[PDB]
Design a protein around this ligand. Structure first.
Ligand SMILES: OC[C@H]1O[C@H](O)[C@H](O)[C@@H](O)[C@@H]1O
Ligand SMILES: [Co+2]
Ligand SMILES: [Mg+2]
Length: 387
């Protein structure tokens, strides 16, 4: 049951199944994975494709000749399996030179290096067929108030993204950028900490059409925010270019649990929204198999990501198809929410005595919204206590 196939557009980062389990308090518990083995194993699980940081595929500092041999092996594995590479990104956070950031490092020479390192990987990503290029500024931020002038930092961040946009347009590349927010960790506070801040920032760039967001379930939940609401706002703005699916139990360190774990009801409402809105991009899993697990548990955890999406998709479809749920939606006036408030226009509204002078405020206040009955139907469908 719930067998994933490539049509389902499930993708995984090389760094996910390949996480060796090193955390801030303990050494690695797993050996390093060959990216070629990950491609073949994920193909066998039913995945659609893989994603990568530059440094996941080419070890940092590699000569131009070593780099070519790493890329050739990888392409051969993709060619053999039919696996796609829909997205790629840059590692601007691991090497000590980025300890104060990349695009917004205080040191100018580091910022220029950050840009050259990124541009180099855009070329490779386009060669391999990526449609989306993600930026996660995990080191852009501060632990203390005086270390970063945030207005100057946002000037430098806008500068960097404007230069990347000039670069792809000057090359005629068919690739778009997606900013991935995170509120904190590894910095005390990270710039553009939520979907909202990233969306607002994009509108100040020179070519806003080239930029969207790559929201992550766990990251918005690290700020205690409602992830489906934030996705709804990104869709409403036309900016949901990509998405990271995983699980998170509340406000704490970034857990990256398998999708479905963490806030299960949020996951249901998320899948309901993505499917009813017709989101067509990849369903990308940014998760870490816990370091308790051996390599069998790694692949079990990866399989569980896809299984939980497919189950929730079935339950959300059953929910929306139920005539009793449709009746409850009308009972809660979800359909009146779709009607314009004042399509008759401002003057008509001003002259409408039924909208104020003769509005029976007490009769309107007495109407129940019937939200609890609707939510219990949603619960019954999630739990399969009905269909
Ligand atoms: O941006 C690409 C990825 O880089 C890092 O691995 C981050 O932990 C992850 O959140 C992000 O999606
Ligand atoms: Co995360
Ligand atoms: Mg992510």
């Amino acid at each position: 049951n719930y067998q994933p196939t490539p049509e389902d557009r499930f993708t995984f980062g090389l760094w996910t199944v390949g996480w060796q389990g090193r955390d801030p308090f303990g050494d690695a518990t797993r050996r390093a994975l060959d990216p070629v083995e990950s491609v073949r194993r994920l193909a066998e699980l039913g995945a659609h494709g893989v994603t990568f940081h530059d440094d996941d595929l080419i070890p940092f500092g590699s000569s131009d000749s070593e780099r070519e041999e790493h890329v050739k092996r990888f392409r051969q594995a993709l060619d053999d399996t039919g696996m796609k590479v829909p997205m790629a990104t840059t590692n601007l956070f691991t090497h000590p030179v980025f300890k104060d950031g990349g695009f917004t490092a205080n040191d100018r020479d580091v910022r220029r290096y950050a840009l050259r390192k990124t541009i180099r990987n855009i070329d490779l990503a386009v060669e391999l067929g990526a449609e989306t290029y993600v930026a996660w500024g995990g080191r852009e931020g501060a632990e203390s108030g005086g270390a970063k002038d945030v207005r100057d930092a946002l000037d430098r961040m806008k500068e960097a993204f404007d230069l990347l946009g000039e670069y792809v347009t000057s090359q005629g590349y068919d690739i778009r950028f997606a900013i991935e927010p995170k509120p904190n960790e590894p910095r005390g506070d990270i710039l553009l900490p939520t979907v909202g801040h990233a969306l607002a920032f994009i509108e100040r760039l020179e070519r806003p059409e080239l930029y969207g967001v790559n929201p992550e379930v766990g990251h918005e939940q690290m700020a205690g925010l409602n992830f489906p609401h934030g996705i709804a706002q990104a869709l409403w703005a036309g900016k949901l270019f990509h998405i990271d699916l995983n699980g998170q139990n509340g406000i704490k360190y970034d857990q990256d649990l398998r999708f479905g774990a963490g806030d299960l009801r949020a996951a249901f409402w998320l899948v309901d929204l993505l499917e009813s809105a017709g989101y067509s991009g990849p369903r990308h899993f940014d998760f870490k198999p816990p370091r308790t697990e051996d390599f069998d548990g790694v692949w079990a955890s990866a399989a569980g990501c896809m299984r939980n999406y497919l189950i929730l998709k079935e339950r959300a479809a059953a929910f929306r198809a139920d005539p009793e749920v449709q009746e409850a939606l009308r009972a809660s006036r979800l359909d009146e929410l779709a009607r314009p408030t004042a399509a008759d226009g401002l003057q008509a509204l001003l002259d409408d005595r039924s909208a104020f002078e003769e509005f029976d405020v007490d009769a309107a206040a007495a109407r129940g919204m019937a939200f609890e009955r609707l939510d219990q139907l949603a619960m019954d469908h999630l739990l399969g206590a009905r269909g």
